[PDB]
Amino acid sequence: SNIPLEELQRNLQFHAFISYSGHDSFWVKNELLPNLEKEGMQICLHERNFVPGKSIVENIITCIEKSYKSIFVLSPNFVQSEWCHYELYFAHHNLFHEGSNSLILILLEPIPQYSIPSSYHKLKSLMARRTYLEWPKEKSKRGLFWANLRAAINIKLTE
């Protein structure tokens, strides 16, 4: 029982775009994607829905524009291999307005401060909010994680 995309104002094709580092593919493909897709959600996926003949940036932007929410799978891997795309793009476009709930942050793995370049200002800003969902190491708290996550996807967008 998720959001019916057709009932929305914009012409959206996906409930969520999932941005992740290829190094985190096992958890994304065996945990994140099944729990969202077995619920009936439509997911725009890094490299799975990307179109040939376009740059990776254009493919990412296309997923974002066609998705109700965007999910970043934060981790040291994501910082090192994926975040630069967004730091560069956010420097010229207010794609996600500070205060809007269109962007969902999953802290899959804690990110040490030394691994964050000083020039990743937008990343430090987003994580200073402390509004991300932490993947719990304790198995008994993973039901809470999935419930929180599905709620973050289905919550009404900030006006």
Author numbering: 624 to 782
Paper text:
Toll-like receptors (TLRs) play an important role in the innate immune response. Receptors belong to the type I of membrane proteins and contain the large extracellular ligand-binding domain, single-pass transmembrane domain, and globular intracellular Toll-interleukin receptor homology (TIR) domain. In particular, TLR1 is shown to form the heterodimers with TLR2, which are activated upon the binding of lipoteichoic acid or cysteine-containing lipopeptides. The overall fold of the resolved structure is typical for the TIR domains: five α-helices and a five-strand β-sheet.
We undertook several attempts to crystallize the TLR1-TIR/Zn complex. Similar to TLR1-TIR without Zn, crystals appeared in several months in P6422 and P6222 space groups, where the last one gave better diffraction. The best crystal diffracted to 1.9 Å and was used for the structure solution. All the crystals that were obtained provided the electron density with the Zn2+ ions absent and all cysteine residues in the oxidized state, similar to the structure of TLR1-TIR without Zn. We assume that the disulfide crosslinked conformation of TLR1-TIR is the only state of the protein capable of crystallization. In our hands, the protein was as well crystallized with the disulfide bonds, being formed in the presence of TCEP agent, whereas no disulfide bonds were observed in several weeks after the sample preparation for the soluble fraction of TLR1-TIR in solution under the similar conditions. It is noteworthy that crystal growth was essentially slow and took several months, and all the reducing agents have a limited lifetime. Thus, it is most likely that the protein crystallization started at a time point when no active TCEP was present in all the buffers, allowing the formation of cysteine bridges inevitably observed in crystallographic structures and necessary for the crystal packing.
